[PDB]
Amino acid sequence: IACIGSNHFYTDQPEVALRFYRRLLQMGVYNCQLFNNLGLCCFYAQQYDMTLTSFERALSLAENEEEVADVWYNLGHVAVGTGDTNLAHQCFRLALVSNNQHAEAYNNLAVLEMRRGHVEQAKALLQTASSLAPHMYEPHFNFATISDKIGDLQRSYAAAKKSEAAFPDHVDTQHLIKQLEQHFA
């Protein structure tokens, strides 16, 4: 049920995943993972009445500091889907405060920072994210993008190549690498 539900959620069918997870809810399962999953599904399946109460039950049920950080990360995703980037800013910072080695929170908080305008903060946060999780492609791509925006084509190349190493079938990474290798001649 969990596997088919995840696969249904990620292949842009969150309502079927919400059904598959409401099934586990119906069978007495009471976790932090299950309720955060129900929150993600309810929000992305466009059921705004049962969305945030599930995240509240999740935050209640979390027996860790990484589970709390993941729930705050997902609440920041909900917030940034709602707009109001300040609430998502706070949620990402709380995900960091709970789990210091949370690279997705670093990446998203750097995206919001560069949205505000603070380029150096975003650069440092993306460097931290790409240092914690090298296997991810978003921190590398964003660092390369901001570098290329300001210049520093060496750092842009060193970051876009690691992006291509992380997600080798990307598209924007390929255009970035083509532009860079063209600037080098």
């Binding site: 466009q46 705004y48 889907g81 709602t82 707009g83 109001d84 980037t85």
Partner: peptide
């Protein structure tokens, strides 16, 4: 976000439309 709000207005849902339009306002 504006397009989602507009389509949910046309679909007469009015609960999601406000959400997406408020997001696009905040952006």
């Amino acid at each position: 976000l504006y397009n989602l709000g507009l389509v949910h207005l046309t679909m007469q849902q009015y609960a999601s439309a406000f959400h997406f339009l408020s997001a696009a306002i905040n952006f």
